[PDB]
Amino acid sequence: KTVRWCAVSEHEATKCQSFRDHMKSVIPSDGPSVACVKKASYLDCIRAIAANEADAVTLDAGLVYDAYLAPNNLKPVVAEFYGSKEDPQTFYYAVAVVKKDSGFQMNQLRGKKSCHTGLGRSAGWNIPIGLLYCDLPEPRKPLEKAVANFFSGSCAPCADGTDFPQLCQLCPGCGCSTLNQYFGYSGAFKCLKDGAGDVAFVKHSTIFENLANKADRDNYELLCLDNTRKPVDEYKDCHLAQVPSHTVVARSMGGKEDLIWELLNQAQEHFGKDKSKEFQLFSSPHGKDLLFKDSAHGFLKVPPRMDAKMYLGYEYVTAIRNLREGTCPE
């Protein structure tokens, strides 16, 4: 009855131990417990789970494509929901955040410096790059190199800085964890805030999570598809796409999914949004989106018959498959 959670680097491990410890106090001795496995990146976590060294890790939907392929063969078991309990959203919006008065529109992105959440993630990579690779009559389509030559420097966490130094320009090394200050949604927004990049590819709640007062948020806007900018509150009218929720994944067979659910259900019940002043499941003095997204309000069980392809949808998986092949309509 021990769920082995795969923590990615230092901060997550810190929060995971605090997760383990607090659960120990509200769950009966015969109930599920948490064990923490620290890994270097999400990829190691996927391998560890498939190799039966850990049992669970939360992933952005785009990374669910990787966990699914053999030899990994992982499946989503618990999805995060955003918004509220009364109105649970199992999707979010990918947006392009720029500083106010920077001048460029969606079509003048070449030559800019970009800030991405991570390589392979929905909002930070799949959505934005998906939208512009084919619009490049230039067949330098083996992605990384095309992107590396499209922008004049980026921070694409988890990318290979040895073959593509340009991709790690804004964050030397392209570290794939929170140890990289420019990692994740808030890492990418910071990359723009710090003025290291001209555009951050994040989600609609990112800025709200980072800039408390409207005053500062006014120094920012969003790039829309029709080549017009708009206020950060107009994300419903100005966003790149709607993507599925981050989901906790487990092994397709012998994945301990019941235990995973009871542990998380019990956790949201005890430390969910608003629940406890002792320990918050969706926030941490040690950082943002550690283990789960700070923007989540709870967890929902994924229907048992639902596999990765059904979870992502036909359009997304195909888009992802095509993206990684540079395939573009002839």
Residues of the shown chain interacting with Fe ion in the complex, contacts defined by CB under 5 A = 60, 122
Instruction: Give me the residue whose beta carbon is nearest to Fe ion.
Output: 60
Tell me the sheet residues that pair with 292: none
Asked if 165 and 186 touch (Cβ cutoff 8 Å), the reply is no
14 is in an annotated binding site: no
Cβ 88 to Fe ion shortest distance, Å: 17
Strands (E), the chain: 2-8, 33-39, 57-59, 74-83, 88-89, 91-99, 114-116, 154-155, 199-203, 220-223, 229-231, 241-244, 247-251, 296-301
| H helical segments located in the chain | 9-26, 42-50, 64-68, 127-133, 144-150, 184-193, 206-210, 214-217, 257-271, 308-312, 314-323
Nearer to Fe ion, 60 or 294 (CB): 60
117 is in an annotated binding site: yes
60 is in an annotated binding site: yes
246 is in an annotated binding site: yes
Nearer to Fe ion, 43 or 328 (CB): 43
235 is in an annotated binding site: no
Q: Looking at residue 179, what DSSP letter applies?
A: T
Q: Looking at residue 143, what DSSP letter applies?
A: T
Nearer to Fe ion, 122 or 284 (CB): 122
Cβ 218 to Fe ion shortest distance, Å: 25
Pairing label, strands 296-301, 74-83: antiparallel
185 is in an annotated binding site: yes
Q: Looking at residue 233, what DSSP letter applies?
A: G
Cβ 63 to Fe ion shortest distance, Å: 9
Nearer to Fe ion, 9 or 122 (CB): 122
Cβ 316 to Fe ion shortest distance, Å: 13
Cβ 177 to Fe ion shortest distance, Å: 16
Nearer to Fe ion, 60 or 198 (CB): 60
Annotated binding-site positions: 60, 92, 117, 121, 123-124, 185, 246
Annotated binding-site positions for Fe(3+): 60, 92, 185, 246
Annotated binding-site positions for hydrogencarbonate: 117, 121, 123-124
